[PDB]
């Protein structure tokens, strides 16, 4: 885990963040010409820990993996706004306190420019490929549309061209649940000894449902009770105790302020903004791209990836029971799409 | 057009708990026939009540000339056991003078059916022509036809499944958790304290409303547009939450959401397949193509397993299609009433 200083960054809004730092992790050696970089773009609650025994995409990064680190140099940042090394709301403001409520709104476009600045500070100027799903797919899409000169190919998984009403609906309500927590303290809870654990748990429980496949959830849990508990006497259902576990697991590893900042960056995703709309922006693409979507995805439904593949100058439909999380679980299917993307960059 | 309160006395619930003096609120439209053979029971959904027709929550299908033509039929609607608009529920007074609150027992759909039947029986009604309902009302209709077939001549079951699913229990239990996390919940004993869990109930309803709508139509209506700083869809959801808080009780929301989570027509009957195959009542089953909460596969299962084809309603409105698609629902009601005649 290294930290790259990129200095002051001017955001799309005109706001400036002083002294931005971007955390970077690398697997594989950089080639003499620096022509073998594959940028792996993490999703909402991910980070730079892509691979290693555990890395959120370990199945696709390593020796002999889809991103074969004997040949490619896999680089992952922690996104701008994150909480695992990069500048975010918990980072220190110039006044010595956490940014907190003063942290500006960040867009996916800002996040791409911060990643590119980190690469440039490392002496890397063109990457072979960008790859990502979900928020990482939004980052990959904005990279190929906004900075095609810097990337030879892209894999865009499980995302749409802009945020949808249903996505903004659940995202805004997840944020509202966090802000309703008595410990949110307007986002300035850092250093107080209190954190909005309850609101973040509620947000994550609803988010987890959006990530899963409806049928698979019912196959896994049905209406089964939690073992030895009777719901009519105050007991819980199996899916209910599982959701409680998911919410608590996130609270134990993730910052509420970062969740809000990054969720907001999902809600403002729109490749068409300032470019004449989604269709005009997608038609402008000059980077070879592979697009994949998952049949059971309820958060970024397949129609969104059909649109990407139709408007960008065929869609890879992955039959999967795992919903949106298919982009993390379907190692072999995703691996084939990665290998196809890397062939386009070679 | 007056709200009547029917005393049904003591009710022993499926859990074994007993409520000493249950009251069920009732509204009626249309004259009861001399033989009492023209009763159509309308079963409301989670946040509905007995006010079906004025407007009422299903006003388009009840009235003179409507799908339930009150010139011929006597439409009767109760407020469900656990409710907050006249029937016994957590905000009702316990024998000790305080609200039931945290002492209110768990209520199942089967309990709700038995309370409705007891209210009808107290009014001298012993067999109904039809039961009709969608969503929680469809669960009530299904348990009525399976558990008490001798009391009903036909049923319309809309936008529900044979048991609660994992996704339904997931969102239901998390909506309840959001209410219970509100500082004003006070263990459910907030009645009379001057404080209510308005924020938690708003959060629950915002998430629930998304489950009731169609993904595509939400994007058609709002996209990522701003409001007039909120996004348009965000302002819409905030409005939906405030609207519910203004008219509905959090404790009842919890009690009735729990009743949805415990829905299972197979319990104590050998499982869903055995229970549905036992149906002796002609039923019409309807589902809506864009429903994200009770997806169409659940109604396919109902139709496949019940002795009785599925009526598939092409609708953009999601689960709320059962409330919005007046013409398609009306056709299904009229089919049901022909089976009862
Ligand atoms: Ca690996
Ligand atoms: Ca419970
Ligand atoms: Ca009417
Ligand atoms: Ca906002
Ligand atoms: Na700089
Ligand atoms: Na009685």
Author numbering:
A (entry chain B): 17 to 69, 77 to 336, 340 to 372
B (entry chain A): 15 to 68, 77 to 250, 258 to 337, 340 to 372
Reproduce text from the manuscript describing this model.
MetX (previously mis-annotated as MetA in the reference genome of M. tuberculosis) is an l-homoserine O-acetyltransferase, commonly also referred to as a homoserine transacetylase (HTA) and is a crucial enzyme in the biosynthesis of methionine and threonine. Here we report the structures of three homologous MetX enzymes from Mycobacterium tuberculosis (MtMetX), Mycolicibacterium abscessus (MaMetX), and Mycolicibacterium hassiacum (MhMetX) and compare them to previously solved structures of HTAs in order to begin development of selective inhibitors of MtMetX via a structure-based approach. MetX can be divided into two distinct structural domains, the catalytic domain, and the lid domain. The organization of the catalytic domains’ fold marks MetX as members of the α/β-hydrolase super-family.
The three solved MetX structures include residues 15–70, 77–372 from MhMetX, 10–379 from MaMetX, and 7–372 from MtMetX. For MtHTA and MhHTA, Ser157, Asp320, and His350 comprise the active site; MaHTA’s triad is comprised of Ser160, Asp327, His357. The extended loop between β3 and β4 show differences in secondary structure content, length, and orientation. Both MhMetX and HiHTA contain a short sequence with helical propensity adjacent to β4. Temperature factors of the equivalent rings in MhMetX is B = 19 Å2, while both MtMetX and MaMetX are B = 21 Å2, values very similar to the HiHTA structure with B = 16 Å2. All three solved MetX have a similar, conserved hydrophobic patch running along the inside of the active site tunnel. All three solved structures crystallized as dimers at the expected interface and orientation that corresponds to predicted physiologically active assembly.
